[PDB]
């Protein structure tokens, strides 16, 4: 149950621990409209040759009236993480770090939403 | 028809900060939550009738502590990494803007706080376990 | 004359605010209605404490709008003014980093207040007196 | 007496972060901006036609050096202080909530940054020049 | 040379890289004014029994009025760090992380000051009050 | 107990109350590796001519693998301030302001640590 890596590009961050999982995106050659759109979360034990897919995440690619609805938005994933962290706060695992994180995520959503509202005033959205 | 599954015990995720214009986010109902949180999420098209959900994407989080149960789903940090990567690509484009910069900053701080939790919980040797 | 009696007006003192030339007064807590002060006066500082030299009057919306109508400004309007002026300052020879940080903080203040408002829109209780 | 006055050269402050559901904010014409900023704001009612403004309140800021023109207006700090006092009153009430707490923190930090600049000018001795 | 650890405790925090230096203070029982006031930074060669000093950092204990200047403030060290990071930003190693740190440290200073300014609204100074 | 100020420069910030102490450092012309490394905290009693020193603070100057361990790192000082501020919070002096300051200092640590980790992913440490 593996699949070849190929030119799938591994997303390494300084803030990755990459202890359990690794994140990949499509080859930078295939980025449409300035950004990657097709991510894979796989298991880290894997050799660089292959990826052990745990999950596939595909973002909205292309204009909506033209290619339909074919993926998720950033806001959706952030909302998922916020929901889970709020659940964790309602448990014995409540802690100040999760609270800080939730605040940071809500402020993130605020700033992206500010981008859309500003365009709306000009009608561009 | 072939793209519809019933809402059933799935709950819509309401948030006032999310536009909900083209998509809706669902999760499993609270009764079914294990390890205190939802783990099985669906993003689906908004203009659907309530009785059904039209799935676009399935996202399944790690259910259970890994040391005990192994690896069976994504982590919060993985999704946040995807979002940071996309926002930084946007910044490296003609559509660089200040709002995207702010969002990147907030997301990186979010990762740093979650990471402080993980660091502290490494030092205690209780990382990936179910202990408080 | 230009002076009015202080009377039951109360001085708003805050360490973070300089207070060299202006003073902020509000109606007394006793006469506060709707859980907050609503009738503020900026006056000149070097005036008799017994009196107030009014520079400006600012009256806020008293009571939810859907129940009492419209009778004053909201917090959001004042903050919008301050943001507009600081941005004008940024688009001038006096552009600086402190003004940029202040604009950011005020915009985040608006976004937090706005999240409250949107959550009450979802709950259908916006502009009411419900919790 | 219709409680209603012509817009004219007044300009409308449209911002993405403001809904304009109940009130609209106007300022004086950009051509009449003195010393790089607007100084004469109006809060009016939104349902009015663009032709006119239904004034609720007028807010004026210090325009010009005090030595020469006097104290003619308010400071940004004054309005921020009013808003903080009001939100802290709300927190001491059944309407206590976390968003208000955030707002207070943000507004206090805003005051801190504005105060920073002055303190800096003071240390360098170039204040109010 | 070397001094033994004895009644000195290592300040471990997960946010600190710990890679070449260690930080020590008086052991908890000796704290005065509810706080550690005598810190030593030292080498990480692990003679668990002993500490290899690099710097002694001593904080003001007590009311200045009662005891006089006898140590350093938190403000002073934070000033040193801000000054170095601003120097770094005026260098080939300018970076966004350093800019963030300078902002966080300036806001730290701003909050501590509020505490004092608010105390000065009541006039209480350098006191147990 | 005095020392001449001489080349030393006073570091003055508005955000400093600084009513009782002043902080001095070496001359900019003697700054090495782009930044100051030698600092003194002194009483403000004195005139410009002299410094009365309460404390000496010397930071690690030169790469650690050439010159050994000859000074402190910013992380150490920030650590100490955090540790004392948490101490005050377990005391009658607990205030919101302090908590907020501890939050800011911890976020400072997170950002500086983000630099090292990034450099580490890129494989570089303490390079020129
Ligand atoms: Zn912040």
XYZ file of C-alpha atoms and ligand atoms in Angstrom:
775
model
C 0.000 0.000 0.000
C 2.429 2.707 -1.106
C 2.647 4.931 -4.159
C 5.731 6.455 -5.854
C 6.905 9.913 -4.847
C 8.248 11.117 -8.174
C 8.253 14.901 -8.376
C 5.774 15.330 -5.519
C 7.559 17.892 -3.355
C 8.056 17.416 0.338
C 6.912 20.321 2.496
C 9.600 20.807 5.170
C 9.222 23.614 7.662
C 11.366 24.789 10.503
C 8.187 24.453 12.569
C 7.674 20.901 11.326
C 8.761 18.316 13.786
C 8.001 15.665 11.132
C 8.065 13.142 13.966
C 5.064 11.052 12.855
C 3.844 12.489 9.539
C 5.154 14.113 6.364
C 3.310 16.539 4.079
C 3.743 16.659 0.292
C 2.336 18.798 -2.506
C 2.328 18.524 -6.267
C 5.536 19.351 -8.145
C 6.198 23.080 -8.200
C 5.994 22.725 -12.005
C 2.300 21.935 -11.714
C 1.211 24.785 -9.440
C -1.753 26.541 -11.052
C -2.530 30.208 -10.313
C 0.585 30.708 -8.138
C -0.064 28.071 -5.443
C -0.169 24.317 -4.776
C -3.539 22.591 -4.634
C -3.070 18.819 -4.117
C -1.509 17.776 -0.817
C -0.784 14.354 0.656
C -0.205 13.523 4.307
C 1.777 10.304 4.566
C 3.788 8.374 7.117
C 7.281 9.547 7.824
C 9.013 6.198 8.059
C 8.824 5.977 4.346
C 11.844 6.197 2.116
C 12.152 9.246 -0.081
C 11.245 7.106 -3.025
C 7.718 6.447 -1.837
C 4.880 8.021 0.100
C 2.619 6.139 2.581
C -0.681 8.049 2.051
C -2.672 8.692 5.189
C -4.861 11.348 3.600
C -5.356 13.459 0.464
C -6.405 17.127 0.627
C -7.389 19.000 -2.543
C -7.998 22.750 -2.609
C -10.354 24.661 -4.891
C -8.477 24.928 -8.185
C -9.620 27.411 -10.808
C -12.652 29.707 -10.965
C -15.802 28.262 -9.503
C -18.277 29.005 -12.313
C -15.780 27.364 -14.699
C -14.478 24.136 -13.101
C -17.199 23.635 -10.515
C -16.466 23.030 -6.863
C -13.463 20.678 -6.762
C -11.831 21.249 -3.380
C -11.723 22.889 0.031
C -10.783 26.385 1.194
C -8.195 27.427 3.770
C -11.028 28.646 6.018
C -12.496 25.131 6.112
C -9.329 23.473 7.463
C -8.716 26.251 9.982
C -12.307 25.790 11.173
C -11.693 22.060 11.627
C -8.628 22.675 13.786
C -10.459 25.341 15.813
C -13.337 22.919 16.438
C -11.010 20.166 17.652
C -9.004 22.500 19.913
C -12.209 23.860 21.440
C -13.262 20.257 22.066
C -9.912 19.615 23.780
C -10.478 22.634 26.027
C -13.693 20.924 27.161
C -11.701 17.940 28.464
C -8.940 17.162 31.013
C -6.443 18.289 28.355
C -7.489 21.939 28.735
C -4.403 24.160 28.783
C -3.173 27.672 28.078
C -1.280 26.681 24.909
C -4.476 25.472 23.213
C -6.208 28.706 24.222
C -3.417 30.763 22.642
C -3.642 28.638 19.494
C -7.413 29.067 19.235
C -7.029 32.821 19.515
C -4.355 32.834 16.814
C -6.588 30.805 14.479
C -9.611 33.052 15.031
C -7.430 36.080 14.270
C -6.199 34.319 11.125
C -9.795 33.866 9.977
C -10.456 37.513 10.830
C -7.629 38.708 8.576
C -8.570 36.497 5.607
C -12.176 37.629 5.996
C -10.970 41.225 6.018
C -9.377 40.598 2.648
C -12.710 39.444 1.174
C -14.802 42.237 2.689
C -12.534 44.925 1.409
C -12.884 43.614 -2.144
C -16.587 43.541 -1.688
C -16.745 47.193 -1.025
C -15.179 47.511 -4.489
C -17.289 44.653 -5.821
C -14.392 42.548 -6.921
C -14.887 39.503 -4.593
C -27.917 11.305 -6.798
C -24.660 9.417 -6.773
C -22.993 12.291 -5.033
C -25.217 12.442 -2.005
C -25.009 10.813 1.379
C -27.474 11.494 4.164
C -26.792 13.989 6.881
C -27.833 11.673 9.628
C -25.792 11.979 12.718
C -23.518 14.537 11.249
C -23.371 17.978 12.574
C -22.911 21.159 10.729
C -20.111 23.309 11.959
C -21.506 26.800 12.493
C -18.985 29.616 12.749
C -19.699 33.324 12.429
C -16.184 33.902 11.074
C -16.685 31.519 8.123
C -18.516 32.761 5.039
C -20.252 29.418 4.258
C -20.959 30.698 0.727
C -19.869 27.707 -1.339
C -19.065 24.977 1.224
C -20.201 23.636 4.593
C -18.137 21.705 7.160
C -19.655 18.709 8.971
C -18.348 16.438 11.621
C -19.595 13.424 13.442
C -22.095 14.046 16.170
C -20.953 14.663 19.700
C -22.230 11.435 21.098
C -19.907 9.624 18.817
C -16.816 11.602 19.642
C -13.930 9.535 20.963
C -10.946 10.895 22.920
C -13.034 14.048 23.577
C -13.024 15.533 20.063
C -14.462 15.014 16.581
C -12.173 13.082 14.260
C -14.196 12.561 11.037
C -14.923 15.707 9.031
C -16.607 16.295 5.676
C -16.523 19.407 3.514
C -19.458 19.538 1.212
C -21.396 21.816 -1.060
C -23.634 24.311 0.644
C -26.556 24.414 -1.651
C -27.861 21.059 -0.727
C -30.942 20.122 1.122
C -30.497 19.523 4.826
C -31.196 15.810 4.746
C -28.193 15.084 2.678
C -24.650 16.145 2.454
C -22.868 16.434 -0.859
C -19.351 15.446 -0.168
C -16.367 17.243 -1.722
C -13.619 16.163 0.662
C -13.140 13.805 3.615
C -10.638 14.697 6.338
C -9.899 12.127 9.053
C -7.796 13.125 12.058
C -5.580 10.886 14.170
C -7.982 9.006 16.476
C -6.349 7.905 19.610
C -2.934 8.418 20.936
C -0.304 7.084 18.563
C 1.920 5.267 20.942
C -1.084 3.244 21.952
C -3.042 2.992 18.709
C -0.650 3.879 16.000
C -1.072 6.153 13.002
C -4.527 6.442 11.439
C -5.194 10.072 10.455
C -3.847 13.589 10.030
C -2.803 16.046 12.733
C -3.862 19.664 13.243
C -0.331 20.777 12.406
C -0.427 19.099 8.983
C -3.469 21.068 7.813
C -2.038 24.268 9.231
C 1.188 23.609 7.312
C -0.771 23.261 4.070
C -2.505 26.596 4.701
C 0.788 28.373 5.488
C 2.341 26.942 2.321
C -0.521 28.188 0.150
C -0.563 31.645 1.743
C 3.190 32.011 1.267
C 2.857 31.005 -2.382
C 0.212 33.730 -2.743
C 2.684 36.155 -1.198
C 5.263 35.122 -3.845
C 2.921 36.275 -6.605
C 1.356 39.462 -8.017
C -1.306 39.181 -5.279
C 0.974 39.795 -2.304
C -0.970 41.726 0.330
C -0.919 42.722 3.990
C -3.917 40.626 5.080
C -2.238 37.433 3.843
C 0.939 38.427 5.686
C -1.039 38.850 8.904
C -2.718 35.463 8.457
C 0.661 33.803 7.904
C 1.973 35.424 11.071
C -1.000 34.286 13.143
C -0.769 30.724 11.764
C 2.949 30.544 12.528
C 2.287 31.743 16.071
C -0.424 29.080 16.349
C 2.161 26.451 15.381
C 4.620 27.888 17.914
C 2.107 27.632 20.782
C 1.082 24.103 19.830
C 4.808 23.403 19.640
C 5.443 24.763 23.115
C 2.825 22.301 24.318
C 4.569 19.490 22.436
C 8.022 20.525 23.747
C 6.864 20.695 27.367
C 5.192 17.319 26.876
C 8.391 15.865 25.402
C 10.383 16.917 28.482
C 7.785 15.159 30.648
C 8.151 12.075 28.419
C 4.375 11.912 28.033
C 4.115 12.972 24.379
C 1.876 10.944 22.109
C 0.412 9.289 25.208
C -3.021 9.841 26.712
C -1.778 11.342 29.965
C -2.472 14.798 31.297
C -19.486 81.837 29.108
C -17.764 78.737 28.027
C -17.929 76.829 31.218
C -20.459 74.464 32.572
C -20.831 73.027 36.057
C -19.126 69.718 36.676
C -21.945 68.560 38.817
C -22.437 64.860 38.694
C -20.010 64.355 35.801
C -17.092 62.038 36.457
C -13.569 62.275 35.255
C -12.168 59.402 33.273
C -8.537 58.902 34.291
C -6.303 56.352 32.564
C -2.542 56.043 32.883
C -2.091 55.172 29.270
C -3.602 58.490 28.228
C -1.535 61.693 28.436
C -4.102 64.275 29.598
C -2.050 67.407 29.000
C -4.625 69.545 27.341
C -7.833 67.660 27.356
C -9.879 65.887 29.907
C -12.572 63.274 29.433
C -15.765 63.374 31.523
C -18.766 61.047 31.635
C -22.082 61.011 33.405
C -22.056 59.467 36.841
C -22.227 55.767 37.408
C -25.353 56.271 39.332
C -27.116 57.823 36.408
C -25.725 55.321 33.995
C -28.286 53.618 31.983
C -28.028 50.431 30.074
C -25.022 49.304 32.055
C -22.578 51.887 30.658
C -21.850 55.608 30.329
C -23.327 57.214 27.227
C -22.766 61.001 27.469
C -19.119 62.048 27.291
C -17.496 65.470 27.249
C -13.996 66.352 26.185
C -13.127 69.587 27.962
C -10.055 71.720 28.421
C -7.822 70.598 31.188
C -6.792 73.901 32.677
C -10.206 74.784 33.899
C -11.598 74.949 37.340
C -12.267 71.484 38.714
C -15.553 72.931 39.811
C -16.331 73.525 36.202
C -15.832 72.007 32.792
C -14.753 73.910 29.705
C -16.506 71.793 27.006
C -14.603 71.191 23.795
C -16.742 68.374 22.434
C -19.852 66.377 23.307
C -20.144 62.707 22.301
C -23.371 60.784 22.888
C -23.573 57.033 22.413
C -26.485 54.824 21.401
C -28.573 54.251 24.563
C -30.468 50.970 24.486
C -30.480 48.384 21.701
C -31.367 49.891 18.341
C -34.128 47.421 17.424
C -35.964 48.441 20.630
C -35.154 52.160 21.068
C -34.206 53.237 17.568
C -31.140 55.269 16.695
C -30.006 57.980 19.106
C -26.195 58.106 19.147
C -22.883 56.842 17.846
C -21.423 53.367 18.339
C -17.908 52.405 19.421
C -17.249 51.216 15.878
C -17.797 54.686 14.380
C -15.258 56.336 16.698
C -12.640 53.645 16.094
C -13.242 54.030 12.354
C -12.479 57.745 12.657
C -9.209 57.054 14.482
C -8.176 54.460 11.899
C -8.954 56.848 9.029
C -6.821 59.587 10.592
C -3.886 57.308 11.382
C -3.912 56.011 7.808
C -3.858 59.592 6.532
C -0.832 60.109 8.815
C 0.808 57.033 7.276
C 0.299 58.526 3.794
C 2.363 61.602 4.627
C 5.927 62.664 5.538
C 5.286 61.352 9.076
C 4.736 57.684 8.205
C 6.191 55.597 11.024
C 6.116 52.166 12.625
C 4.202 53.112 15.785
C 1.254 54.381 13.734
C 1.303 51.136 11.737
C 1.136 49.022 14.898
C -1.707 51.186 16.222
C -3.696 50.802 12.987
C -3.193 47.043 13.248
C -4.413 46.950 16.863
C -7.496 49.056 16.071
C -8.360 46.894 13.069
C -8.078 43.791 15.258
C -10.333 45.495 17.809
C -12.923 46.007 15.068
C -12.567 42.358 14.034
C -13.182 41.098 17.579
C -16.227 43.353 18.021
C -17.367 42.205 14.595
C -17.081 38.561 15.554
C -19.402 39.304 18.474
C -21.829 40.994 16.081
C -21.719 38.150 13.525
C -22.269 35.531 16.219
C -25.316 37.469 17.372
C -26.530 37.686 13.750
C -26.326 33.896 13.552
C -28.174 33.642 16.882
C -30.669 36.173 15.495
C -30.268 38.406 18.551
C -28.309 41.309 17.044
C -29.429 44.738 18.171
C -31.617 43.208 20.881
C -31.043 43.152 24.638
C -30.727 39.371 24.826
C -27.526 37.628 25.980
C -35.683 71.412 10.703
C -35.917 68.067 8.887
C -32.776 67.091 10.852
C -31.094 66.699 7.508
C -28.269 68.526 5.695
C -26.669 68.267 2.238
C -23.726 65.936 1.718
C -22.064 68.154 -0.859
C -18.287 67.815 -0.798
C -18.421 65.549 2.275
C -16.815 62.161 1.699
C -18.117 58.802 2.889
C -15.801 56.541 4.915
C -16.443 53.097 3.395
C -14.316 50.413 5.084
C -14.516 46.634 4.784
C -14.463 46.240 8.568
C -17.585 48.394 9.046
C -21.020 47.023 8.156
C -22.848 50.377 7.689
C -25.968 48.635 8.977
C -27.193 51.499 11.169
C -24.732 54.417 10.901
C -22.563 56.017 8.209
C -19.360 57.982 8.866
C -18.498 61.058 6.788
C -15.506 63.376 6.772
C -14.690 66.684 5.099
C -13.593 66.815 1.454
C -10.087 65.508 0.806
C -9.243 68.865 -0.825
C -9.896 70.521 2.562
C -7.725 68.135 4.585
C -5.293 70.237 6.612
C -1.925 68.920 7.812
C -2.364 65.563 6.005
C -5.424 64.251 7.880
C -9.179 64.777 8.133
C -10.389 66.643 11.198
C -14.193 67.126 10.936
C -16.244 63.926 11.090
C -19.991 63.323 11.059
C -21.900 60.222 12.154
C -25.269 60.084 10.417
C -27.958 57.572 9.676
C -27.491 55.043 6.930
C -30.935 54.950 5.298
C -30.677 58.467 4.045
C -30.116 59.226 0.364
C -26.561 59.913 -0.808
C -27.670 63.422 -1.434
C -27.994 64.139 2.200
C -26.672 63.245 5.559
C -28.923 62.713 8.577
C -26.476 63.880 11.275
C -26.464 62.097 14.607
C -23.204 63.440 15.983
C -20.285 65.687 15.052
C -16.690 64.953 16.094
C -13.885 67.413 15.618
C -10.200 66.926 16.160
C -7.466 69.354 16.910
C -6.668 71.186 13.814
C -3.594 73.145 14.098
C -1.063 74.069 16.651
C -2.579 74.843 20.006
C -0.377 77.849 20.452
C -1.822 79.474 17.437
C -5.356 78.234 17.104
C -6.172 77.033 20.526
C -7.654 73.844 21.686
C -10.241 73.223 19.029
C -10.711 69.551 19.065
C -10.273 66.149 20.455
C -7.449 63.684 20.295
C -7.532 60.108 19.015
C -6.584 59.055 22.554
C -9.781 60.623 23.903
C -12.118 58.598 21.686
C -10.181 55.407 22.363
C -10.434 56.071 26.096
C -14.195 56.560 25.789
C -14.513 53.210 23.996
C -12.366 51.371 26.563
C -14.369 52.780 29.481
C -17.575 51.742 27.755
C -16.440 48.176 27.016
C -15.152 47.755 30.576
C -18.573 48.836 31.800
C -20.031 46.122 29.553
C -17.695 43.546 31.101
C -19.144 44.439 34.518
C -22.615 43.368 33.382
C -24.590 40.335 32.144
C -23.083 41.032 28.709
C -19.546 40.052 29.784
C -17.854 38.127 26.980
C -14.443 37.204 25.581
C -14.629 39.332 22.415
C -14.998 42.477 24.518
C -11.930 41.411 26.509
C -9.934 41.044 23.293
C -11.107 44.469 22.170
C -9.955 46.068 25.421
C -6.524 44.471 25.124
C -6.175 45.675 21.524
C -7.236 49.240 22.382
C -4.877 49.443 25.361
C -1.997 48.237 23.168
C -2.955 50.827 20.564
C -2.682 53.524 23.229
C 0.675 52.056 24.210
C 2.086 52.392 20.678
C 0.816 55.957 20.236
C 2.340 56.818 23.606
C 5.600 55.227 22.510
C 6.172 57.700 19.816
C 5.753 60.681 22.034
C 8.039 59.254 24.644
C 10.581 58.723 21.945
C 10.306 62.277 20.699
C 10.672 63.394 24.296
C 13.797 61.438 24.893
C 15.247 62.931 21.728
C 13.884 66.310 22.742
C 12.139 66.931 19.476
C 8.614 66.647 20.900
C 5.772 68.629 19.430
C 7.933 70.414 16.942
C 37.165 28.292 38.239
C 34.324 26.148 39.452
C 31.872 26.578 42.308
C 29.594 23.801 43.394
C 25.907 23.779 42.600
C 24.880 23.443 46.158
C 22.029 25.678 46.895
C 21.556 26.871 43.337
C 18.922 25.700 40.974
C 18.981 25.286 37.224
C 16.361 27.265 35.373
C 15.055 24.841 32.737
C 12.423 26.002 30.267
C 11.352 24.095 27.169
C 11.384 27.256 25.033
C 15.151 27.655 25.565
C 17.577 25.751 23.328
C 19.904 24.948 26.294
C 22.659 24.070 23.932
C 25.835 25.699 25.340
C 24.790 27.624 28.479
C 22.776 26.938 31.626
C 21.074 29.406 33.954
C 20.968 29.136 37.755
C 19.453 31.080 40.641
C 19.217 30.857 44.360
C 17.366 27.856 45.513
C 13.710 28.375 46.077
C 13.809 28.674 49.850
C 16.177 31.637 49.834
C 13.992 33.839 47.773
C 13.327 37.213 49.080
C 10.521 39.517 48.039
C 8.964 36.418 46.541
C 11.559 36.163 43.855
C 14.933 35.019 42.722
C 17.398 37.840 42.683
C 20.802 36.216 42.208
C 21.326 34.385 38.903
C 24.464 32.897 37.351
C 24.806 31.784 33.757
C 27.275 28.964 33.283
C 28.810 26.278 31.123
C 27.033 23.166 30.167
C 29.851 20.737 30.680
C 27.890 18.667 33.061
C 29.706 18.477 36.271
C 26.393 17.967 37.852
C 28.022 18.794 41.173
C 29.474 22.099 40.012
C 28.644 25.211 38.012
C 31.180 26.836 35.643
C 30.320 30.581 35.831
C 30.178 32.848 32.800
C 28.124 35.775 34.161
C 26.612 36.907 37.456
C 23.334 38.804 37.173
C 21.891 40.334 40.333
C 18.526 41.937 40.724
C 17.415 44.705 42.975
C 16.176 43.334 46.202
C 13.965 45.531 48.159
C 12.627 48.958 48.170
C 15.106 51.345 46.840
C 14.128 53.587 49.666
C 14.850 50.963 52.271
C 17.762 49.134 50.714
C 19.052 51.276 47.947
C 20.214 50.278 44.539
C 21.628 46.833 44.867
C 20.828 45.227 41.550
C 19.294 45.211 38.101
C 15.789 45.559 36.705
C 14.054 43.336 34.180
C 13.642 46.497 32.069
C 17.435 46.805 31.850
C 18.094 43.328 30.456
C 15.184 43.598 28.027
C 16.699 46.894 26.862
C 20.030 45.173 26.209
C 18.322 42.479 24.139
C 16.270 45.008 22.154
C 19.411 47.023 21.388
C 21.296 43.974 20.142
C 18.387 42.806 17.981
C 18.063 46.258 16.424
C 21.796 46.184 15.688
C 21.301 42.769 14.056
C 18.529 44.298 11.966
C 21.055 46.920 10.834
C 23.290 44.183 9.444
C 23.467 41.555 6.665
C 21.486 39.232 8.946
C 18.269 41.297 8.977
C 15.328 38.946 9.264
C 11.605 38.821 9.975
C 12.067 36.703 13.117
C 14.229 39.391 14.737
C 11.641 42.014 13.766
C 8.955 39.958 15.500
C 11.102 39.564 18.605
C 11.743 43.311 18.809
C 7.993 43.902 18.624
C 7.244 41.336 21.345
C 9.918 42.767 23.668
C 8.746 46.347 23.141
C 5.220 45.257 24.028
C 6.561 43.507 27.142
C 8.114 46.822 28.156
C 4.815 48.571 27.425
C 2.821 46.356 29.777
C 5.185 46.585 32.664
C 5.059 50.307 32.296
C 1.312 50.363 32.527
C 1.598 48.760 35.811
C 3.876 51.508 36.994
C 1.895 54.325 35.385
C -1.232 53.050 36.976
C 0.623 52.893 40.292
C 1.720 56.482 39.683
C -1.889 57.414 39.221
C -2.010 56.568 42.938
C 1.557 57.663 43.712
C 2.753 54.377 45.228
C 6.470 53.905 44.521
C 9.177 51.300 45.047
C 7.026 49.789 47.768
C 5.563 46.627 49.258
C 2.257 48.390 48.764
C 33.361 53.605 43.314
C 33.322 55.134 39.880
C 34.652 54.532 36.397
C 35.022 56.897 33.565
C 32.297 56.839 30.938
C 34.527 57.748 28.116
C 33.701 55.845 24.954
C 30.674 54.290 26.443
C 27.284 55.099 25.119
C 24.118 55.461 27.077
C 21.230 53.508 25.856
C 18.095 55.443 26.225
C 14.589 54.230 25.404
C 11.304 55.908 26.111
C 9.804 52.741 27.198
C 12.249 52.993 30.037
C 11.242 54.513 33.329
C 14.969 54.326 34.054
C 14.689 56.875 36.864
C 17.242 55.125 39.085
C 19.489 53.178 36.693
C 21.034 53.861 33.312
C 22.394 51.315 30.846
C 25.616 51.880 29.004
C 27.471 50.015 26.332
C 30.564 50.106 24.291
C 31.124 52.541 21.540
C 29.637 51.770 18.210
C 33.054 52.033 16.639
C 34.083 49.158 18.776
C 31.069 47.058 18.002
C 32.098 43.746 16.777
C 30.187 41.370 14.639
C 27.549 43.977 13.968
C 26.308 44.448 17.542
C 27.103 45.406 21.100
C 28.509 42.785 23.414
C 29.550 44.540 26.526
C 27.137 46.365 28.750
C 26.975 48.022 32.090
C 24.083 48.941 34.329
C 24.910 51.986 36.358
C 23.391 54.423 38.870
C 21.975 57.552 37.483
C 23.246 59.570 40.355
C 26.333 60.524 38.561
C 27.134 63.079 35.897
C 28.020 62.348 32.307
C 31.673 62.061 33.208
C 31.456 58.854 35.144
C 29.613 55.628 35.471
C 28.890 54.062 38.826
C 28.469 50.501 38.114
C 25.941 48.171 39.629
C 26.349 45.332 37.150
C 28.363 44.076 34.175
C 26.741 42.055 31.365
C 28.837 40.495 28.588
C 27.360 38.605 25.644
C 28.960 35.786 23.666
C 31.011 37.502 20.946
C 32.506 35.575 18.059
C 31.236 32.172 16.922
C 31.036 29.653 19.733
C 33.237 27.144 17.857
C 36.127 29.587 17.409
C 36.176 31.555 20.651
C 34.659 29.234 23.274
C 31.923 30.315 25.677
C 32.711 33.904 26.688
C 29.313 35.483 27.365
C 25.558 35.153 27.671
C 22.852 34.758 25.020
C 19.682 36.845 24.737
C 17.662 33.692 25.497
C 19.315 33.419 28.937
C 18.436 36.955 30.070
C 14.889 36.661 28.723
C 14.623 33.339 30.587
C 15.539 34.999 33.837
C 12.996 37.778 33.371
C 10.297 35.204 32.614
C 11.270 33.213 35.690
C 11.031 36.204 38.028
C 7.752 37.338 36.452
C 6.187 33.925 37.023
C 7.539 34.162 40.571
C 5.637 37.431 41.077
C 2.522 35.804 39.728
C 2.595 33.322 42.596
C 2.519 36.156 45.025
C 0.316 38.983 46.127
C 1.752 41.042 43.298
C -0.042 39.133 40.608
C -1.348 41.393 37.973
C -2.636 41.036 34.460
C 0.099 43.165 33.178
C 2.673 40.697 34.270
C 0.896 37.816 32.655
C 0.668 39.644 29.473
C 4.373 40.442 29.703
C 5.171 36.759 30.270
C 3.120 35.957 27.160
C 5.041 38.487 25.066
C 8.411 37.205 26.318
C 7.495 33.588 25.567
C 6.449 34.596 22.055
C 9.810 36.351 21.664
C 11.504 33.083 22.562
C 9.330 31.244 20.039
C 10.284 33.634 17.216
C 14.033 33.498 17.926
C 13.803 29.712 18.145
C 11.991 29.706 14.825
C 15.110 31.202 13.279
C 17.452 28.467 14.410
C 15.120 25.730 13.374
C 14.662 27.191 9.962
C 18.406 27.474 9.542
C 18.717 23.937 10.674
C 16.295 22.686 7.997
C 18.413 24.587 5.478
C 21.493 23.021 7.085
C 23.247 26.141 8.208
C 24.315 27.249 11.681
C 26.369 30.276 12.695
C 27.704 30.791 9.207
C 29.042 34.024 7.768
Zn -0.669 39.962 19.270
